[PDB]
PDB file of C-alpha atoms and ligand atoms in Angstrom:
ATOM      1  CA  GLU A 388      25.557  12.811  -1.059  1.00 42.98           C
ATOM      2  CA  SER A 389      26.514  15.285  -3.868  1.00 43.03           C
ATOM      3  CA  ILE A 390      26.820  19.055  -3.395  1.00 44.66           C
ATOM      4  CA  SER A 391      24.414  19.648  -6.358  1.00 43.65           C
ATOM      5  CA  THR A 392      21.624  17.776  -4.616  1.00 44.18           C
ATOM      6  CA  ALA A 393      22.327  19.589  -1.369  1.00 43.64           C
ATOM      7  CA  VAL A 394      22.206  22.889  -3.289  1.00 43.68           C
ATOM      8  CA  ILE A 395      18.857  22.158  -4.964  1.00 41.02           C
ATOM      9  CA  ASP A 396      17.495  21.153  -1.544  1.00 40.00           C
ATOM     10  CA  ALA A 397      18.843  24.319   0.101  1.00 39.42           C
ATOM     11  CA  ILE A 398      17.334  26.505  -2.635  1.00 40.11           C
ATOM     12  CA  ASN A 399      13.971  24.706  -2.302  1.00 41.16           C
ATOM     13  CA  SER A 400      14.192  25.184   1.405  1.00 44.90           C
ATOM     14  CA  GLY A 401      15.227  28.883   1.218  1.00 47.60           C
ATOM     15  CA  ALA A 402      17.988  28.082   3.743  1.00 46.97           C
ATOM     16  CA  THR A 403      21.818  28.097   3.391  1.00 47.55           C
ATOM     17  CA  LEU A 404      23.914  24.904   3.350  1.00 43.99           C
ATOM     18  CA  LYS A 405      25.810  26.542   6.195  1.00 43.14           C
ATOM     19  CA  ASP A 406      22.576  26.652   8.336  1.00 43.80           C
ATOM     20  CA  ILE A 407      21.310  23.258   7.117  1.00 44.68           C
ATOM     21  CA  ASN A 408      24.635  21.616   8.096  1.00 46.33           C
ATOM     22  CA  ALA A 409      25.123  23.909  11.116  1.00 46.84           C
ATOM     23  CA  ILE A 410      28.731  24.741  10.131  1.00 50.04           C
ATOM     24  CA  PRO A 411      30.168  26.845  12.966  1.00 48.91           C
ATOM     25  CA  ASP A 412      30.616  30.572  12.228  1.00 46.39           C
ATOM     26  CA  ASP A 413      34.230  30.537  13.356  1.00 46.41           C
ATOM     27  CA  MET A 414      34.987  27.928  10.688  1.00 48.28           C
ATOM     28  CA  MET A 415      33.228  29.959   7.947  1.00 47.51           C
ATOM     29  CA  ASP A 416      35.119  33.095   9.096  1.00 44.11           C
ATOM     30  CA  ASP A 417      38.416  31.238   8.838  1.00 45.66           C
ATOM     31  CA  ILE A 418      37.737  30.130   5.231  1.00 47.58           C
ATOM     32  CA  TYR A 419      36.639  33.697   4.337  1.00 45.89           C
ATOM     33  CA  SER A 420      39.684  35.186   5.904  1.00 45.41           C
ATOM     34  CA  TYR A 421      41.969  32.775   3.918  1.00 46.74           C
ATOM     35  CA  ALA A 422      39.972  33.469   0.733  1.00 46.69           C
ATOM     36  CA  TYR A 423      40.331  37.235   1.160  1.00 47.03           C
ATOM     37  CA  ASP A 424      44.005  36.805   1.748  1.00 47.20           C
ATOM     38  CA  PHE A 425      44.353  35.191  -1.746  1.00 47.77           C
ATOM     39  CA  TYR A 426      42.286  37.989  -3.278  1.00 52.13           C
ATOM     40  CA  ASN A 427      44.381  40.798  -1.706  1.00 54.07           C
ATOM     41  CA  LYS A 428      47.596  39.176  -2.657  1.00 57.20           C
ATOM     42  CA  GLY A 429      46.311  39.150  -6.248  1.00 55.14           C
ATOM     43  CA  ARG A 430      46.169  35.229  -6.415  1.00 53.01           C
ATOM     44  CA  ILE A 431      42.915  35.288  -8.304  1.00 56.11           C
ATOM     45  CA  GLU A 432      42.736  31.610  -9.413  1.00 56.81           C
ATOM     46  CA  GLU A 433      43.074  30.370  -5.772  1.00 54.03           C
ATOM     47  CA  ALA A 434      40.745  33.112  -4.473  1.00 52.06           C
ATOM     48  CA  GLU A 435      38.077  32.087  -6.968  1.00 53.84           C
ATOM     49  CA  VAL A 436      37.758  28.496  -5.752  1.00 54.78           C
ATOM     50  CA  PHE A 437      37.477  29.672  -2.176  1.00 53.71           C
ATOM     51  CA  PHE A 438      34.845  32.308  -3.005  1.00 52.89           C
ATOM     52  CA  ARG A 439      32.839  29.999  -5.194  1.00 55.16           C
ATOM     53  CA  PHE A 440      32.682  27.482  -2.318  1.00 56.05           C
ATOM     54  CA  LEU A 441      31.667  30.311   0.093  1.00 53.10           C
ATOM     55  CA  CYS A 442      28.780  31.532  -2.036  1.00 52.08           C
ATOM     56  CA  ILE A 443      27.673  27.899  -2.516  1.00 53.07           C
ATOM     57  CA  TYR A 444      27.594  27.363   1.292  1.00 53.73           C
ATOM     58  CA  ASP A 445      26.129  30.702   2.164  1.00 53.82           C
ATOM     59  CA  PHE A 446      24.298  32.213  -0.823  1.00 56.75           C
ATOM     60  CA  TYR A 447      22.795  35.036   1.293  1.00 56.82           C
ATOM     61  CA  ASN A 448      26.125  36.358   2.444  1.00 56.42           C
ATOM     62  CA  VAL A 449      26.880  39.813   0.856  1.00 56.10           C
ATOM     63  CA  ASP A 450      30.590  39.712   1.632  1.00 58.64           C
ATOM     64  CA  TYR A 451      30.935  36.325  -0.121  1.00 57.23           C
ATOM     65  CA  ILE A 452      28.890  37.369  -3.116  1.00 55.14           C
ATOM     66  CA  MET A 453      30.770  40.741  -3.431  1.00 53.08           C
ATOM     67  CA  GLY A 454      34.056  38.936  -3.197  1.00 52.79           C
ATOM     68  CA  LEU A 455      33.144  36.478  -5.975  1.00 52.03           C
ATOM     69  CA  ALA A 456      31.563  39.272  -8.139  1.00 51.65           C
ATOM     70  CA  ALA A 457      34.891  41.228  -7.860  1.00 48.44           C
ATOM     71  CA  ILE A 458      36.745  38.109  -9.023  1.00 50.21           C
ATOM     72  CA  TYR A 459      34.500  37.623 -12.060  1.00 48.25           C
ATOM     73  CA  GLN A 460      34.881  41.328 -12.947  1.00 48.22           C
ATOM     74  CA  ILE A 461      38.688  41.028 -12.741  1.00 47.26           C
ATOM     75  CA  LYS A 462      38.530  37.890 -15.059  1.00 46.49           C
ATOM     76  CA  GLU A 463      36.339  39.942 -17.386  1.00 46.26           C
ATOM     77  CA  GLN A 464      33.297  37.740 -16.926  1.00 46.18           C
ATOM     78  CA  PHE A 465      31.266  40.941 -16.876  1.00 45.18           C
ATOM     79  CA  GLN A 466      27.792  39.443 -17.163  1.00 46.82           C
ATOM     80  CA  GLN A 467      28.318  36.977 -14.292  1.00 46.47           C
ATOM     81  CA  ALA A 468      29.881  39.858 -12.162  1.00 48.67           C
ATOM     82  CA  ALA A 469      26.914  42.072 -12.906  1.00 46.96           C
ATOM     83  CA  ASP A 470      24.467  39.296 -11.919  1.00 48.00           C
ATOM     84  CA  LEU A 471      26.161  38.720  -8.604  1.00 45.16           C
ATOM     85  CA  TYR A 472      26.381  42.542  -7.918  1.00 45.02           C
ATOM     86  CA  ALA A 473      22.685  42.813  -8.443  1.00 42.88           C
ATOM     87  CA  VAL A 474      21.996  40.104  -5.778  1.00 41.11           C
ATOM     88  CA  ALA A 475      24.499  41.831  -3.416  1.00 42.55           C
ATOM     89  CA  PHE A 476      22.642  45.106  -3.862  1.00 39.62           C
ATOM     90  CA  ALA A 477      19.221  43.480  -3.319  1.00 38.98           C
ATOM     91  CA  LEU A 478      20.565  41.935  -0.058  1.00 38.88           C
ATOM     92  CA  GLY A 479      22.136  45.232   1.097  1.00 35.69           C
ATOM     93  CA  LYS A 480      20.340  48.287  -0.346  1.00 36.40           C
ATOM     94  CA  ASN A 481      22.288  50.815   1.796  1.00 33.11           C
ATOM     95  CA  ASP A 482      25.440  50.034  -0.112  1.00 32.46           C
ATOM     96  CA  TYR A 483      25.916  51.480  -3.619  1.00 31.57           C
ATOM     97  CA  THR A 484      29.343  49.882  -4.176  1.00 30.49           C
ATOM     98  CA  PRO A 485      27.648  46.976  -6.121  1.00 32.26           C
ATOM     99  CA  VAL A 486      25.673  49.499  -8.176  1.00 30.10           C
ATOM    100  CA  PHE A 487      28.936  51.282  -9.018  1.00 33.47           C
ATOM    101  CA  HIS A 488      30.640  48.004 -10.067  1.00 35.59           C
ATOM    102  CA  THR A 489      27.658  46.976 -12.142  1.00 36.84           C
ATOM    103  CA  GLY A 490      28.027  50.319 -13.907  1.00 37.99           C
ATOM    104  CA  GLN A 491      31.592  49.422 -14.813  1.00 38.21           C
ATOM    105  CA  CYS A 492      30.414  45.964 -16.025  1.00 39.25           C
ATOM    106  CA  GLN A 493      27.661  47.433 -18.171  1.00 37.52           C
ATOM    107  CA  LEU A 494      30.167  49.791 -19.837  1.00 35.75           C
ATOM    108  CA  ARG A 495      32.399  46.835 -20.694  1.00 38.66           C
ATOM    109  CA  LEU A 496      29.389  44.923 -22.083  1.00 37.20           C
ATOM    110  CA  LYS A 497      28.788  47.940 -24.369  1.00 37.24           C
ATOM    111  CA  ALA A 498      25.564  49.068 -22.679  1.00 35.91           C
ATOM    112  CA  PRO A 499      26.630  52.686 -21.985  1.00 35.59           C
ATOM    113  CA  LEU A 500      23.006  53.482 -21.182  1.00 38.83           C
ATOM    114  CA  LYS A 501      22.524  50.968 -18.467  1.00 37.98           C
ATOM    115  CA  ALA A 502      25.984  52.082 -17.189  1.00 37.20           C
ATOM    116  CA  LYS A 503      24.975  55.766 -16.975  1.00 39.57           C
ATOM    117  CA  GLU A 504      21.890  54.756 -15.079  1.00 39.32           C
ATOM    118  CA  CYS A 505      23.963  52.896 -12.427  1.00 39.91           C
ATOM    119  CA  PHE A 506      26.444  55.830 -12.100  1.00 37.27           C
ATOM    120  CA  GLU A 507      23.511  58.264 -11.621  1.00 39.43           C
ATOM    121  CA  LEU A 508      21.986  56.114  -8.896  1.00 40.95           C
ATOM    122  CA  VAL A 509      25.333  56.188  -7.068  1.00 40.60           C
ATOM    123  CA  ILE A 510      25.630  59.950  -7.364  1.00 41.41           C
ATOM    124  CA  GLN A 511      22.039  60.326  -6.304  1.00 42.29           C
ATOM    125  CA  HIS A 512      21.914  57.978  -3.244  1.00 43.25           C
ATOM    126  CA  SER A 513      25.395  56.969  -2.100  1.00 43.68           C
ATOM    127  CA  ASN A 514      26.970  58.725   0.958  1.00 42.12           C
ATOM    128  CA  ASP A 515      30.425  57.465  -0.072  1.00 44.31           C
ATOM    129  CA  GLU A 516      32.414  60.461  -1.409  1.00 43.57           C
ATOM    130  CA  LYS A 517      35.061  58.335  -3.158  1.00 43.10           C
ATOM    131  CA  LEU A 518      32.373  56.215  -4.888  1.00 41.22           C
ATOM    132  CA  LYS A 519      30.612  59.388  -6.012  1.00 41.26           C
ATOM    133  CA  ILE A 520      33.753  60.975  -7.439  1.00 40.88           C
ATOM    134  CA  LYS A 521      34.479  57.751  -9.411  1.00 40.69           C
ATOM    135  CA  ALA A 522      30.914  57.575 -10.672  1.00 41.41           C
ATOM    136  CA  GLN A 523      30.980  61.273 -11.685  1.00 40.47           C
ATOM    137  CA  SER A 524      34.253  60.751 -13.590  1.00 41.19           C
ATOM    138  CA  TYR A 525      32.706  57.823 -15.548  1.00 39.13           C
ATOM    139  CA  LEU A 526      29.634  59.893 -16.328  1.00 41.03           C
ATOM    140  CA  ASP A 527      31.841  62.751 -17.598  1.00 43.23           C
ATOM    141  CA  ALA A 528      33.955  60.302 -19.685  1.00 41.15           C
ATOM    142  CA  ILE A 529      30.949  58.612 -21.320  1.00 39.83           C
ATOM    143  CA  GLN A 530      29.149  61.910 -22.042  1.00 35.47           C
TER     144      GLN A 530
ATOM    145  CA  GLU B 803      14.768  32.598  -2.551  1.00 38.44           C
ATOM    146  CA  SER B 804      14.722  33.539  -6.278  1.00 42.65           C
ATOM    147  CA  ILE B 805      17.818  35.155  -4.722  1.00 42.42           C
ATOM    148  CA  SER B 806      19.507  31.802  -4.030  1.00 41.90           C
ATOM    149  CA  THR B 807      18.658  30.690  -7.605  1.00 43.35           C
ATOM    150  CA  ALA B 808      20.213  33.868  -8.977  1.00 45.81           C
ATOM    151  CA  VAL B 809      23.507  33.238  -7.098  1.00 47.82           C
ATOM    152  CA  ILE B 810      23.742  29.573  -8.181  1.00 46.02           C
ATOM    153  CA  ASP B 811      22.786  30.328 -11.781  1.00 48.00           C
ATOM    154  CA  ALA B 812      25.376  33.038 -12.004  1.00 47.46           C
ATOM    155  CA  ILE B 813      28.031  30.673 -10.638  1.00 47.70           C
ATOM    156  CA  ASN B 814      26.904  27.848 -12.929  1.00 48.24           C
ATOM    157  CA  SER B 815      27.169  29.897 -16.098  1.00 44.42           C
ATOM    158  CA  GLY B 816      31.009  29.662 -16.206  1.00 42.70           C
ATOM    159  CA  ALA B 817      32.776  26.430 -17.282  1.00 39.88           C
ATOM    160  CA  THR B 818      35.147  24.881 -14.718  1.00 41.46           C
ATOM    161  CA  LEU B 819      38.202  22.633 -15.255  1.00 43.61           C
ATOM    162  CA  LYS B 820      36.200  19.585 -14.276  1.00 45.75           C
ATOM    163  CA  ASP B 821      33.187  20.647 -16.432  1.00 44.52           C
ATOM    164  CA  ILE B 822      34.939  20.515 -19.729  1.00 40.81           C
ATOM    165  CA  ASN B 823      35.956  16.811 -19.299  1.00 39.48           C
ATOM    166  CA  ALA B 824      39.363  17.094 -20.861  1.00 40.38           C
ATOM    167  CA  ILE B 825      41.246  15.020 -18.339  1.00 39.94           C
ATOM    168  CA  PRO B 826      40.755  11.263 -18.209  1.00 38.14           C
ATOM    169  CA  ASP B 827      39.670   9.730 -14.855  1.00 39.40           C
ATOM    170  CA  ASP B 828      42.587   7.363 -14.619  1.00 42.71           C
ATOM    171  CA  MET B 829      45.066  10.219 -15.108  1.00 44.23           C
ATOM    172  CA  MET B 830      43.308  12.012 -12.196  1.00 48.88           C
ATOM    173  CA  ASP B 831      43.631   8.783 -10.151  1.00 48.42           C
ATOM    174  CA  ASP B 832      47.299   8.421 -11.045  1.00 48.78           C
ATOM    175  CA  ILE B 833      48.001  12.005 -10.043  1.00 46.70           C
ATOM    176  CA  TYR B 834      46.239  11.444  -6.710  1.00 44.08           C
ATOM    177  CA  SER B 835      48.095   8.125  -6.108  1.00 41.91           C
ATOM    178  CA  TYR B 836      51.465   9.776  -6.755  1.00 36.92           C
ATOM    179  CA  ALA B 837      50.679  12.850  -4.643  1.00 36.05           C
ATOM    180  CA  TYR B 838      49.589  10.566  -1.794  1.00 37.59           C
ATOM    181  CA  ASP B 839      52.757   8.360  -2.201  1.00 40.25           C
ATOM    182  CA  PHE B 840      54.972  11.398  -2.229  1.00 40.83           C
ATOM    183  CA  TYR B 841      53.330  12.441   1.009  1.00 38.10           C
ATOM    184  CA  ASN B 842      53.768   8.997   2.740  1.00 35.62           C
ATOM    185  CA  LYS B 843      57.361   8.952   1.612  1.00 36.74           C
ATOM    186  CA  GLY B 844      58.182  12.337   3.038  1.00 37.13           C
ATOM    187  CA  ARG B 845      58.537  14.182  -0.226  1.00 36.20           C
ATOM    188  CA  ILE B 846      56.488  17.101   0.950  1.00 35.17           C
ATOM    189  CA  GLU B 847      57.174  19.874  -1.522  1.00 33.40           C
ATOM    190  CA  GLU B 848      56.145  17.731  -4.430  1.00 33.72           C
ATOM    191  CA  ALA B 849      53.095  16.370  -2.606  1.00 34.27           C
ATOM    192  CA  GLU B 850      52.101  19.928  -1.793  1.00 33.96           C
ATOM    193  CA  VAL B 851      52.194  21.085  -5.450  1.00 34.53           C
ATOM    194  CA  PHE B 852      50.134  18.183  -6.710  1.00 35.62           C
ATOM    195  CA  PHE B 853      47.565  18.204  -3.930  1.00 33.18           C
ATOM    196  CA  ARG B 854      47.097  21.917  -4.547  1.00 30.20           C
ATOM    197  CA  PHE B 855      46.566  21.237  -8.247  1.00 31.45           C
ATOM    198  CA  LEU B 856      44.038  18.604  -7.237  1.00 27.55           C
ATOM    199  CA  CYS B 857      42.185  21.021  -4.952  1.00 28.07           C
ATOM    200  CA  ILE B 858      41.881  23.545  -7.779  1.00 26.22           C
ATOM    201  CA  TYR B 859      40.603  20.895 -10.210  1.00 26.65           C
ATOM    202  CA  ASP B 860      37.908  19.618  -7.752  1.00 26.07           C
ATOM    203  CA  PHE B 861      37.689  21.702  -4.569  1.00 25.72           C
ATOM    204  CA  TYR B 862      34.634  19.638  -3.475  1.00 23.56           C
ATOM    205  CA  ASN B 863      36.641  16.413  -3.214  1.00 24.87           C
ATOM    206  CA  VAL B 864      37.311  15.801   0.461  1.00 22.29           C
ATOM    207  CA  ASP B 865      40.263  13.555  -0.211  1.00 23.00           C
ATOM    208  CA  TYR B 866      42.002  16.372  -2.062  1.00 22.38           C
ATOM    209  CA  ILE B 867      41.261  18.911   0.701  1.00 21.54           C
ATOM    210  CA  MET B 868      42.312  16.537   3.545  1.00 24.10           C
ATOM    211  CA  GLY B 869      45.424  15.723   1.573  1.00 22.26           C
ATOM    212  CA  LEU B 870      46.583  19.351   1.414  1.00 19.85           C
ATOM    213  CA  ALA B 871      45.313  20.079   4.963  1.00 20.14           C
ATOM    214  CA  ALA B 872      47.518  17.238   6.297  1.00 17.44           C
ATOM    215  CA  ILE B 873      50.546  18.619   4.415  1.00 17.52           C
ATOM    216  CA  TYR B 874      50.076  22.074   5.991  1.00 17.25           C
ATOM    217  CA  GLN B 875      49.727  20.399   9.400  1.00 18.29           C
ATOM    218  CA  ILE B 876      52.963  18.467   8.912  1.00 15.59           C
ATOM    219  CA  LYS B 877      54.676  21.640   7.749  1.00 16.52           C
ATOM    220  CA  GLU B 878      53.411  23.412  10.897  1.00 14.53           C
ATOM    221  CA  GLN B 879      51.308  25.830   8.902  1.00 13.41           C
ATOM    222  CA  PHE B 880      48.597  25.371  11.495  1.00 15.91           C
ATOM    223  CA  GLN B 881      46.268  28.197  10.463  1.00 14.43           C
ATOM    224  CA  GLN B 882      46.239  27.124   6.793  1.00 15.96           C
ATOM    225  CA  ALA B 883      45.721  23.492   7.856  1.00 17.01           C
ATOM    226  CA  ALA B 884      42.817  24.565  10.082  1.00 14.99           C
ATOM    227  CA  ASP B 885      41.290  26.619   7.226  1.00 12.20           C
ATOM    228  CA  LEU B 886      41.332  23.606   4.893  1.00 12.15           C
ATOM    229  CA  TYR B 887      40.057  21.246   7.650  1.00 14.48           C
ATOM    230  CA  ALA B 888      37.064  23.616   7.948  1.00 15.83           C
ATOM    231  CA  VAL B 889      36.413  23.177   4.247  1.00 16.77           C
ATOM    232  CA  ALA B 890      36.722  19.357   4.653  1.00 15.54           C
ATOM    233  CA  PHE B 891      34.244  19.439   7.498  1.00 16.39           C
ATOM    234  CA  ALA B 892      31.758  21.445   5.481  1.00 15.54           C
ATOM    235  CA  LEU B 893      32.152  19.067   2.535  1.00 12.07           C
ATOM    236  CA  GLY B 894      31.943  16.022   4.743  1.00 11.15           C
ATOM    237  CA  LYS B 895      29.066  13.828   5.800  1.00 12.24           C
ATOM    238  CA  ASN B 896      29.202  14.060   9.645  1.00 17.13           C
ATOM    239  CA  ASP B 897      32.886  13.128   9.569  1.00 17.97           C
ATOM    240  CA  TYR B 898      34.567  14.632  12.583  1.00 18.02           C
ATOM    241  CA  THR B 899      38.125  13.776  11.644  1.00 21.87           C
ATOM    242  CA  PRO B 900      38.802  17.293  10.241  1.00 22.77           C
ATOM    243  CA  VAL B 901      37.318  18.789  13.496  1.00 24.22           C
ATOM    244  CA  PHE B 902      39.732  16.699  15.505  1.00 24.08           C
ATOM    245  CA  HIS B 903      42.736  17.816  13.429  1.00 27.76           C
ATOM    246  CA  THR B 904      41.477  21.405  13.732  1.00 28.57           C
ATOM    247  CA  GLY B 905      41.619  20.917  17.544  1.00 26.80           C
ATOM    248  CA  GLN B 906      45.245  19.867  17.335  1.00 29.20           C
ATOM    249  CA  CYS B 907      45.989  22.907  15.112  1.00 29.47           C
ATOM    250  CA  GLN B 908      44.174  25.289  17.491  1.00 27.69           C
ATOM    251  CA  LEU B 909      46.117  23.880  20.395  1.00 30.42           C
ATOM    252  CA  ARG B 910      49.344  24.492  18.549  1.00 30.08           C
ATOM    253  CA  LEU B 911      48.184  28.015  17.696  1.00 28.00           C
ATOM    254  CA  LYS B 912      47.898  28.591  21.490  1.00 28.24           C
ATOM    255  CA  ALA B 913      44.081  28.810  21.253  1.00 28.30           C
ATOM    256  CA  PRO B 914      43.253  26.149  23.947  1.00 29.52           C
ATOM    257  CA  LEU B 915      39.614  27.265  24.207  1.00 28.40           C
ATOM    258  CA  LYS B 916      39.138  26.781  20.521  1.00 26.45           C
ATOM    259  CA  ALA B 917      40.975  23.436  20.711  1.00 28.59           C
ATOM    260  CA  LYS B 918      38.678  22.336  23.560  1.00 28.14           C
ATOM    261  CA  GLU B 919      35.547  23.196  21.546  1.00 26.17           C
ATOM    262  CA  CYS B 920      36.814  21.097  18.627  1.00 21.27           C
ATOM    263  CA  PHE B 921      37.555  18.066  20.838  1.00 22.93           C
ATOM    264  CA  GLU B 922      34.226  18.527  22.674  1.00 23.33           C
ATOM    265  CA  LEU B 923      32.454  18.602  19.376  1.00 21.60           C
ATOM    266  CA  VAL B 924      34.149  15.321  18.308  1.00 21.83           C
ATOM    267  CA  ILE B 925      33.161  13.602  21.574  1.00 24.13           C
ATOM    268  CA  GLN B 926      29.597  14.852  21.280  1.00 25.50           C
ATOM    269  CA  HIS B 927      28.896  13.861  17.652  1.00 27.65           C
ATOM    270  CA  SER B 928      31.438  11.500  16.358  1.00 28.92           C
ATOM    271  CA  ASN B 929      30.725   7.821  15.955  1.00 33.33           C
ATOM    272  CA  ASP B 930      34.397   6.884  15.549  1.00 35.59           C
ATOM    273  CA  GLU B 931      35.716   5.367  18.771  1.00 35.12           C
ATOM    274  CA  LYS B 932      39.399   5.710  18.117  1.00 34.20           C
ATOM    275  CA  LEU B 933      38.787   9.360  17.303  1.00 34.75           C
ATOM    276  CA  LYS B 934      36.774  10.009  20.529  1.00 34.93           C
ATOM    277  CA  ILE B 935      39.468   8.347  22.584  1.00 39.53           C
ATOM    278  CA  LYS B 936      42.112  10.726  21.153  1.00 36.11           C
ATOM    279  CA  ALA B 937      39.834  13.704  21.559  1.00 36.94           C
ATOM    280  CA  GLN B 938      39.052  12.757  25.270  1.00 35.47           C
ATOM    281  CA  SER B 939      42.751  12.470  25.968  1.00 31.66           C
ATOM    282  CA  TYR B 940      43.437  15.906  24.537  1.00 33.24           C
ATOM    283  CA  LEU B 941      40.540  17.358  26.572  1.00 32.19           C
ATOM    284  CA  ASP B 942      41.963  15.730  29.760  1.00 29.16           C
ATOM    285  CA  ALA B 943      45.485  17.011  29.085  1.00 29.27           C
ATOM    286  CA  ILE B 944      44.228  20.587  28.494  1.00 28.41           C
ATOM    287  CA  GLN B 945      41.898  20.803  31.562  1.00 30.59           C
TER     288      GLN B 945
HETATM  289 NA1   NA C1115      37.065  45.660  -8.879  1.00 29.14          NA
END
């Protein structure tokens, strides 16, 4: 029946629609690869429908969630972007990229304080030099 | 978890085209009928544009997906067709038609092993006789 029922069931079950329907991995990879192609080519409207479907069918997948969070951030839906980046971080705590992006979202939502906090976390725990230089530049700009 | 709720809530906070209810149902039906007629009548470029519009307006409508997937197939854009057939399969209720068309696309993309898995999958799970007969023939021809 309808995807919204299936979704409520999947949440209640703590399992992904992908697992529940046993969609093969190769098929999921193909959709993701197409979706990323739209994103990289800058075709954000087409990329968004693909990524929204991906996160619906596999809501535990960090690459899907990061992809859709990047799209929201680019469309300036800062609060939705920040919410997805927080889930991505919770599912992958070795990676500070989502904490960095959330910092940029918080700045745009006029919460300089929350933003500084994110940028400090990155500087403190990330091993990604480029991420740390960006975060340090934001922290210097915000004072 | 509360994780899956957080993903779905974030995604559900933004309005979609279909959410705002600005387009009458019969207009949507007319657009689909014309797109489908253009297709059947060989006017492919026009069918392509409209079916793509339809897929953006309701990506979870299998008829829209299968419509554009079939256009890519006919245009020999076999990878794109295969990517949309994977979406149709995930949307679909045990319907193995998109899996079968994926097999034909794989075979044309010189991935016979992938093709053979598609056709095997149809034979194993499909309840559509005409479809299993085509799939068995492809399997026999590929060896
Ligand atoms: Na970005």
